[PDB]
Amino acid sequence: MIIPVRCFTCGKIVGNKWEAYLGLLQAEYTEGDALDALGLKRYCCRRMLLAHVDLIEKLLNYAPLEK
Amino acid sequence: QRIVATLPYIKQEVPIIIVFRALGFVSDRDILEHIIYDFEDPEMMEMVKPSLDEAFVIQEQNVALNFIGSRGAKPGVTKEKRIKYAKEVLQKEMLPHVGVSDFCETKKAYFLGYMVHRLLLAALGRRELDDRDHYGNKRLDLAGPLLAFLFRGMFKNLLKEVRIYAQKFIDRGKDFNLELAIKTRIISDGLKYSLATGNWGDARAGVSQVLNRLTFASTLSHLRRLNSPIGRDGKLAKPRQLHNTLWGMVCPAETPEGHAVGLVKNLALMAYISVGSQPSPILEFLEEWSMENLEEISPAAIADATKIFVNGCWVGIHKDPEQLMNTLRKLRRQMDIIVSEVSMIRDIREREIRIYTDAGRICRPLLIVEKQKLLLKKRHIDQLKEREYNNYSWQDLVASGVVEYIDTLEEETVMLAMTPD
Amino acid sequence: VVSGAKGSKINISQVIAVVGQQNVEGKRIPFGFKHRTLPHFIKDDYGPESRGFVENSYLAGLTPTEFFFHAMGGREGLIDTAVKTAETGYIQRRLI
Amino acid sequence: QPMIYICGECHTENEIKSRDPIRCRECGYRIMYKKRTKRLVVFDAR
Amino acid sequence: PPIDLQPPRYLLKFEQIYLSKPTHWDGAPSPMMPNEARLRNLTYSAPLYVDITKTVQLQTQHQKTFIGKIPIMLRSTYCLLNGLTDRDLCELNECPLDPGGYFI
Amino acid sequence: LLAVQKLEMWLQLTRPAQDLLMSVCMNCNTHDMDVISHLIKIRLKPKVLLNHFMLCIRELLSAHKDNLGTTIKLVIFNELSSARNPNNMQVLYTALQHSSELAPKFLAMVFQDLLTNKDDYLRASRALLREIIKQTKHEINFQAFCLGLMQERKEPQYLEMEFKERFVVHITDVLAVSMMLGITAQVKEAGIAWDKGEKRNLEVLRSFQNQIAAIQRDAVWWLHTVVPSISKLAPKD
RNA sequence: GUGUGUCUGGGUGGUGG
Ligand SMILES: [Mg+2]
Ligand SMILES: [Zn+2]
Ligand SMILES: [Zn+2]
């Protein structure tokens, strides 16, 4: 539901790359070009940052059970 | 080769012509006219001969009623109650979809002659034998009719309870509290019990299942599931077969692999079961469009004309069915008094038009092709691209006459294109 | 295949060349509709494509009519397995 | 002894004693949640 | 059919149905949300009201009398989740992507 | 309604359809909006109905004033009843293109009265105006429409209630901003050309600038007249 | 200066090999 810290296959850190990827997409860069600009050359990491679903945002819509 | 009928709530079988005479047809010509429509045809008139020999004992209506009333579950010893029982059976039990009140015996006789005629057509091979696995001959009892069936018996029990209560209090000559007279708990208890256990009525079990929340696909599959109540242990492998009619309605792949193969089925993506609609606009429109009713026609006029059926009830005939079908399709595409889910089938080889409005019919949207061109044009797509902006919805596309819902029975007579190229 | 570990030459042919003829109850696809297998076909069409012959292979990709016919054949296989299990079970119990 | 629950809606802390009606102290909600334990929570970061 | 019991004699007839939104009771009535029904093991039902004539003439109108409770399929026109936005559905601790179509 | 149904039925002769359309035009000249919704706003699907709509549109061009009144009533019914039809839209295009600032003025007065009265009408009105500007591209001047709408047809009457007055003020502010939506397809093409190059099509650029200046003057007049119209006007807004 | 009671009997549905 949240971006994994490490790529499953090789172990490159991709926990810091989700927000930069979203910013590049908002900058009308093609997701292939966005992934290229983030240095993810191995297609394992491209899969990592490309197939991720940002479901933690949907969970944040619900109220906390205690404040 | 005498013809026999199994009248409801009668222990022993009866000849058909005896039922015809009991309906009020002493003569023989009118009966065969109601059965046979082409008197120049001698073959169907030939095979109906061994039935007619059973008419020797019975010509009068009274003795026919005596025969069809003496074989009931409750024995009848004297004349008048046997006649009353036969009249009650022939008025209320058999063929209620044609008529339940009085002044409908002739329509019931017409339908009975029609079904005998259908049997004779099948016997000669002029008409194909019906297929039990055809999805057009099947109705899907959704939540609506199931809850309605429960509620009917439950309300009947409530009325019985309040009747017993009132009868008990009346003997003392006292008024009451009506709220105290209505034990409100039985309806809620019955609905809750049936919804929880899944036992329907009283016979039928497993209707209600716990929603499978393992994954989202499981929830969607469970909500769109449908079950065939045919015997799971049965050796007949015909109903488990993936019938050809399941195309576009039912998923061909999705089925349990255990003992429930082919009986439990899942809807296709675009499939949409009909919810039901009243047939009164159908009937009022048809009479406005030269639909000559059964009560006004001569029985010989149906030799060439085409029968018209509304929800399985034969009402009237039409001289020219082609333009009738064209204008009905125009009305359906134009979103007039007739709704989209109404099925419009026309058997052409045997002159019949059958209009259906009942619930449980399965249908899916399809694009419409006219003059080898798609009625859908670039303008619809351009509007649909701005769907979130100008609220041009799929409903507008249906109302534009570009798409329509085709039932399985209607799917028989369509010519379907896989793709525009 | 030649090692005999798994598969068959029929599997090779179906994957590469031609899936073949789909059958229901030992015969071709029946006229479930009125004188046609599917509404996409002309009435009284006895040709290969109309009656279940899957021209394409598993590599090229089945056309949707062929997909449906292949589904019918697979369903026949599954039903046969499901009834066969119970029948043979009772026979075996009596035999022992 | 001073058992604390959490309202489902108000997310308020309520001193509910034994064999008491389960009522919120603000909105009167019927559903209450328990607070996380105090003993020790340790996980090896695997 | 209208049930009739007899001397004096009165006739009972039901004319109109009135189904309110789902509620739960105890003290004052309160609307019940599907999450509340799931957690508290309540039947997500709605009360069914009818109006009855008792003519003995001496015509008495029992407007809107309770006769039973009917379960409500979720996300239907009479469920409490009908027509709500995603933000409102989330605020009720309900999943906006949930399709409904089931009873509780 | 007999005109549209008969014209569609006779469609796949020409003289009988034209005669029926002329009779409908005479009736419209004779002359609330329920009949217009029942006849003009009927959503008939077939292309025979499209031929009927074309014949009625030609008659509407022949009967520009009464057609403008009927189209204004149809637009009012479409906005208030939350429904629309392609035939009603085509009739609206014909009425707008036939008589400049006559059909849109009354239509916008009816729309402003409805918006002051009921909500859920600004988005539909904006979409209808955008569709009309894209398709017809003739005499679609919503600036004059809004200017006429400000005070003529029941403008004090539709703002009697506090909520109604607030709706009227919001509708007036939207119409003050709707001048951009009121530009026709030629102005949009000129904007595309200016995006390609600000100097290309200098004469077309000057014509678009003059039309936009007229629209801006109308919007400024609407903004100036709105403040005395609404007592509950917010200073910052 | 200790220590055994573990809600049975039916029905329905889903599932795995
Ligand atoms: Mg096995
Ligand atoms: Zn990697
Ligand atoms: Zn609270």
Curated annotation (Swiss-Prot), chain F:
Family: Belongs to the Integrator subunit 1 family.
Function comment: Component of the integrator complex, a multiprotein complex that terminates RNA polymerase II (Pol II) transcription in the promoter-proximal region of genes.
Compartment(s) where it occurs, according to its Swiss-Prot or TrEMBL record: Nucleus; Nucleus membrane
Subunit structure and binding partners: Component of the Integrator complex, composed of core subunits INTS1, INTS2, INTS3, INTS4, INTS5, INTS6, INTS7, INTS8, INTS9/RC74, INTS10, INTS11/CPSF3L, INTS12, INTS13, INTS14 and INTS15. The core complex associates with protein phosphatase 2A subunits PPP2CA and PPP2R1A, to form the Integrator-PP2A (INTAC) complex. Interacts with ESRRB, ESRRB is not a core component of the Integrator complex and this association is a bridge for the interaction with the multiprotein complex Integrator; attracts the transcriptional machinery.
Location of this fragment in the whole protein: 365 to 607 of 2190
Disease with which this protein is associated in UniProt: Neurodevelopmental disorder with cataracts, poor growth, and dysmorphic facies: An autosomal recessive neurodevelopmental disorder characterized by severe global developmental delay with motor impairment, cognitive delays, absent or severely limited speech, dysmorphic features, hypotonia and cataracts.
Protein name: Integrator complex subunit 1
Organism: Homo sapiens (Human)
